[PDB]
Curated annotation (Swiss-Prot), chain A:
It is found in: Nucleus. It comes from Saccharomyces cerevisiae (strain ATCC 204508 / S288c) (Baker's yeast). The chain holds residues 379 to 432 of 539 of the full protein. Belongs to the TAF12 family. The gene is TAF12. This is SAGA complex/transcription factor TFIID complex subunit TAF12. Component of the 1.8 MDa SAGA (Spt-Ada-Gcn5 acetyltransferase) complex, which is composed of 19 subunits TRA1, SPT7, TAF5, NGG1/ADA3, SGF73, SPT20/ADA5, SPT8, TAF12, TAF6, HFI1/ADA1, UBP8, GCN5, ADA2, SPT3, SGF29, TAF10, TAF9, SGF11 and SUS1. Functions as a component of both the DNA-binding general transcription initiation factor complex TFIID and the transcription coactivator SAGA complex. Binding of TFIID to a promoter (with or without TATA element) is the initial step in pre-initiation complex (PIC) formation. Present with 930 (+/-45) molecules/cell in log phase SD medium.
From Swiss-Prot, chain B:
Belongs to the TAF10 family. This is SAGA complex/transcription factor TFIID complex subunit TAF10. The lineage of its organism: Eukaryota, Fungi, Dikarya, Ascomycota, Saccharomycotina. Residues 1-125 form the Histone-fold domain. The chain holds residues 70 to 206 of 206 of the full protein. Functions as a component of both the DNA-binding general transcription initiation factor complex TFIID and the transcription coactivator SAGA complex. Binding of TFIID to a promoter (with or without TATA element) is the initial step in pre-initiation complex (PIC) formation.
Curated annotation (Swiss-Prot), chain E:
It is found in: Nucleus. Component of the 1.8 MDa SAGA (Spt-Ada-Gcn5 acetyltransferase) complex, which is composed of 19 subunits TRA1, SPT7, TAF5, NGG1/ADA3, SGF73, SPT20/ADA5, SPT8, TAF12, TAF6, HFI1/ADA1, UBP8, GCN5, ADA2, SPT3, SGF29, TAF10, TAF9, SGF11 and SUS1. This is SAGA complex subunit HFI1. Component of the transcription coactivator SAGA complex. SAGA acts as a general cofactor required for essentially all RNA polymerase II transcription. At the promoters, SAGA is required for transcription pre-initiation complex (PIC) recruitment. It influences RNA polymerase II transcriptional activity through different activities such as TBP interaction (via core/TAF module) and promoter selectivity, interaction with transcription activators (via Tra1/SPT module), and chromatin modification through histone acetylation (via HAT module) and deubiquitination (via DUB module). It comes from Saccharomyces cerevisiae (strain ATCC 204508 / S288c) (Baker's yeast). The lineage of its organism: Eukaryota, Fungi, Dikarya, Ascomycota, Saccharomycotina. It comes from the Eukaryota.
UniProtKB/Swiss-Prot annotation, chain F:
The lineage of its organism: Eukaryota, Fungi, Dikarya, Ascomycota, Saccharomycotina. Belongs to the ataxin-7 family. Component of the transcription coactivator SAGA complex. SAGA acts as a general cofactor required for essentially all RNA polymerase II transcription. At the promoters, SAGA is required for transcription pre-initiation complex (PIC) recruitment. It influences RNA polymerase II transcriptional activity through different activities such as TBP interaction (via core/TAF module) and promoter selectivity, interaction with transcription activators (via Tra1/SPT module), and chromatin modification through histone acetylation (via HAT module) and deubiquitination (via DUB module). This is SAGA complex subunit SGF73. Present with 486 molecules/cell in log phase SD medium. It is found in: Nucleus; Cytoplasm. It comes from the Eukaryota. Transmembrane segments: none annotated. The chain holds residues 353 to 436 of 657 of the full protein. Component of the 1.8 MDa SAGA (Spt-Ada-Gcn5 acetyltransferase) complex, which is composed of 19 subunits TRA1, SPT7, TAF5, NGG1/ADA3, SGF73, SPT20/ADA5, SPT8, TAF12, TAF6, HFI1/ADA1, UBP8, GCN5, ADA2, SPT3, SGF29, TAF10, TAF9, SGF11 and SUS1. Disulfide bonds: none annotated.
């Protein structure tokens, strides 16, 4: 992961070919966890305590 | 069908419990909440009576387990009923009473004692902790 | 270690509800729950039987711990009727007494916890670790029947709360049992009764108690 | 007993010269239960890791929920300052005692 | 003096002991202001002991410049009164590592005890909410083997806070639930933390009718009312 | 004589006062964190004007405790104060 946009790419020297790893892959990321995220959790806790149950 | 509360009060109209009216009245006016219905007083009397029946019954279980005489009487109940049935008229006594004397001075000298060290464990089941030591040094 | 009784736990799970090949984690959690419950049963029964003055744990001494459930001890009494008088009873106060897959459904019920021999059970549960004497007259048969009942009731309530969590999930936005289902089934089965709490409710102090055995 | 008369000297040391008979018995049956619970929890905490820091852990486990808390004046001062933000309401000016509204009084109730 | 009948039947060992006690047996403190001060201040672990210095240098644990930052980052967590939701794993982790740096533990906090704390909060609040729920209602279908919808109010979570008082931490939280949870009907609860002032009844002041524009303090509180 | 023994026994009982070994100060989470946060803001805001030194450590800049890595069961410790 290297998001620095400056000359030398946040490295001691500006070669930029000598200061970069050989074989890389994509960094871990996550999508928008809006659907799976609940603003209120205590309402879910009272929901699993107090259900209708007839 | 499980009885509704109105049926219980309609039966308490006819059958009053053990704890009489004035004991319930003293505990009422000791805890506030003056009520004028006799059936609520009889229902609270029956509730307290049932709760202490359960506590004293659990004390009876804890006092019958913790004595070797009671579990040995329950083990050898019909085994000694055999000896009592073979205890016929006087011809037939010489082959018995090899074990009768020791449990005779055990079972006839044992009366069930409601004890502090028994009730403390019967209500430590119910949430209390009645810790009375056995000596004071 | 652990994971000793996995296939037998699966066999006892099959009798309660559907099986759907339960995972390693559910069987491991049920094994650790039953291994804890057996140690608590043996500790309470040994504490009760030592004060009588006999280190040999009697058969009735473990039925003492489940004396409240009358239907379950009647079930134990019918379970002790194919091997081809309680001390706290009403008669025993007084001194003297007078004179196609249905077959596959059944064979899973015949599969038990400690039916074969008490060889893996004795060093798994640790019978010799906490018992001061030699209890093995019928304590192992009752300690098999109790674990069968524990696993049956535990997976029954875990199935019912999995179904209720399923209907709660399909109502919120509109197959296998997990460790969270077993843990909340444990929370359902380990709530103290109201009559066993009544005498500490208005006074404020942290209730110390004992683990309720099934 | 030695501790009945030691409790006599303890009660007299704090200027308590009139008391009943079962009061040192109640103090001894409190101290027995308290020391037994503390030593049982300390035996648990020593099997975990006897000593004095073990006793300190076992008596800090149960200080947190039963006896009188320590230095509660600054929390009570903070709590008072949260309550004494609101200025006082408007009072009646008819020189008497005014009741709450009728639903907030113990009169419109039924048995 | 007059206690010859009582101080004499103590045994000789007991009396030879109890003619020796004094004040100065301890190394404690008893000034409650100073106890509250030491419970208030944030403390960072330092090192002077050489064996513990080589023990903490071997396990790559850092100097106190990192533990002080960990104190600050464990304090700067949006604690659960402000967020109005139960906390998550990163908030749990940061608060517990800040607390463990407060107590002295310079190691690493395990990743399973956070989930254990989560299930602890689960069963704690489930116990409290369940024994508030079964008091406003008698569930006839439950509690048996053969009316509408109720919302629990703060007066009810004070009313069954005392009928079953054992269920609490007995810390600050129960003190505030007993002391400040009940509100009188002029309490002005649906607010913005400042509108219960007396000057919000008496007229927004306007602006800049002056060469030097110094204003009054009754306008500064209207200025801070908007934010 | 029993008289000097009795008066010295009463002298012994009049000098013994117990302290508790463990006392849990009644406090809060929220008032502690809010005290810390407001003190951090107003400690980072102004300056110190020292004689020779300022209080605080890295990113505290206030009166900070000096609990050791060992002796975590001690009842008192040192604090930081600007020394001239």
């Amino acid at each position: 992961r290297s998001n620095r946009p400056t000359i030398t790419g946040g490295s001691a020297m500006n070669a930029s070919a000598l200061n970069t790893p050989a074989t890389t892959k994509l960094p871990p990321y996550e999508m928008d966890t809006q659907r799976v995220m609940s603003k209120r959790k205590l309402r879910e806790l009272v929901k699993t305590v107090g259900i209708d149950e007839g | 069908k499980d009885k509704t509360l109105e049926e219980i009060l309609e039966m308490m109209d006819s059958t009053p419990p053990i704890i009489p009216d004035a004991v319930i009245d003293y505990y009422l006016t000791k805890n506030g909440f003056n009520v004028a219905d006799v059936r609520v007083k009889r229902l609270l009397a029956l509730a307290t009576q049932k709760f202490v029946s359960d506590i004293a019954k659990d004390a009876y279980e804890y006092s019958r387990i913790r004595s070797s005489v009671a579990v040995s009487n329950a083990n050898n109940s019909q085994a000694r009923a055999r000896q009592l049935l073979q205890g016929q008229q006087q011809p037939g006594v010489q082959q018995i009473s090899q074990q009768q004397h020791q449990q005779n001075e055990k079972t006839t000298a044992s009366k069930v004692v409601l004890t502090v060290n028994d009730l403390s464990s019967a209500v430590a089941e119910y949430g209390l902790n009645i810790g009375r030591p056995d000596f004071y040094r | 270690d652990k994971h000793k009784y996995r296939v037998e736990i699966q066999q006892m799970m099959f009798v309660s509800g559907e099986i759907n090949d339960p995972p390693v984690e559910t069987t491991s959690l049920i094994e650790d729950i039953v291994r804890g419950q057996v140690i608590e049963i043996l500790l309470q029964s040994n504490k009760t039987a030592h004060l009588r003055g006999s280190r040999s744990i009697l058969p009735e001494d473990v039925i003492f711990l489940i004396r409240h459930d009358k239907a379950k001890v009647n079930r134990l009494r019918t379970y002790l009727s194919w091997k081809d008088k309680l001390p706290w009873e009403l008669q025993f106060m007084f001194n003297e007494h007078p004179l196609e897959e249905y077959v596959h459904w059944s064979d899973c019920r015949q599969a038990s916890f400690t039916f074969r021999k008490n060889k893996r059970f004795k060093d798994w549960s640790g019978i010799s670790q906490l018992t001061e004497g030699k209890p093995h007259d019928d304590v192992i048969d009752i300690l098999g029947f109790l674990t069968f009942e524990i696993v049956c009731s535990l997976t029954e309530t875990a199935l019912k709360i999995k179904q209720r969590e399923q209907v709660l999930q399909t109502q919120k936005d509109k197959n296998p049992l997990k460790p969270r289902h077993i843990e909340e089934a444990w929370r359902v089965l380990q709530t103290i009764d109201m009559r066993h709490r009544a005498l500490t409710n208005f006074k404020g102090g942290r209730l110390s108690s004992k683990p309720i055995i099934m | 007993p030695r501790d009945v008369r030691l409790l006599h000297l303890l009660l007299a040391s704090q200027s308590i010269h009139q008391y009943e008979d079962q009061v040192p018995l109640q103090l001894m049956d409190f101290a027995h239960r308290y020391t037994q619970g503390v030593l049982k929890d300390a035996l648990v905490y020593n099997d975990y890791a006897l000593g004095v820091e073990d006793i300190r852990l076992a008596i800090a486990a149960r200080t947190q929920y039963q006896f009188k808390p320590t230095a509660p004046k600054e929390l009570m001062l903070q709590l008072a300052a949260e309550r004494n933000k609101k200025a006082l309401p408007q009072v009646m000016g008819t020189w008497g005692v005014r009741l709450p509204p009728e639903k907030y009084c113990l009169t419109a109730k039924e048995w | 003096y007059k206690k010859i009948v009582m101080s004499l039947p103590l045994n000789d060992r007991n009396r030879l002991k109890m003619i020796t006690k004094e004040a100065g047996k301890r190394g404690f403190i008893f000034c409650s202001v100073f106890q509250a001060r030491l419970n208030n201040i944030p403390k960072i672990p330092i090192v002077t002991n050489p064996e513990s210095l080589k023990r903490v240098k071997s396990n790559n644990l850092k100097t106190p410049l990192e533990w002080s930052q960990d104190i600050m980052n464990g304090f700067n967590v949006p604690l659960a009164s402000e967020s109005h939701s139960l906390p998550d794993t990163d908030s749990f982790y940061l608060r517990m590592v800040g607390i463990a740096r407060e107590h002295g533990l310079v190691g690493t906090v395990d990743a399973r005890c956070v989930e254990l704390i989560s299930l602890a909060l689960d069963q704690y609040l489930k116990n409290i909410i369940e024994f508030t729920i079964d008091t406003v209602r008698y569930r006839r279908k439950k509690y048996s083997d053969y009316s509408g919808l109720y919302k629990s109010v703060s007066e009810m979570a004070a009313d069954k806070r005392d009928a079953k008082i054992k269920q609490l931490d007995d810390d600050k939280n129960e003190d505030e639930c007993a002391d400040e949870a009940k509100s009188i009907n002029n309490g002005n609860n649906s607010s913005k933390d400042d509108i219960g002032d007396i000057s919000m009844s008496s007229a927004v002041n306007e602006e800049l009718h002056e060469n030097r524009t110094i204003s009054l303090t009754n306008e500064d509180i209207y200025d801070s009312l908007s934010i | 004589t029993p008289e000097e023994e009795t008066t010295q026994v009463l002298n012994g009982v009049s000098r013994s006062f117990p302290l508790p070994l463990e006392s849990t100060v009644l406090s809060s989470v929220r008032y502690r964190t809010k005290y810390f946060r407001m003190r951090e803001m107003f400690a980072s805001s102004f300056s110190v004007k020292p004689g020779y030194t300022s209080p605080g450590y890295g990113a505290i800049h206030s009166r900070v405790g000096c609990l050791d890595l060992d002796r975590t069961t001690d009842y008192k410790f040192r604090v930081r104060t600007p020394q001239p």
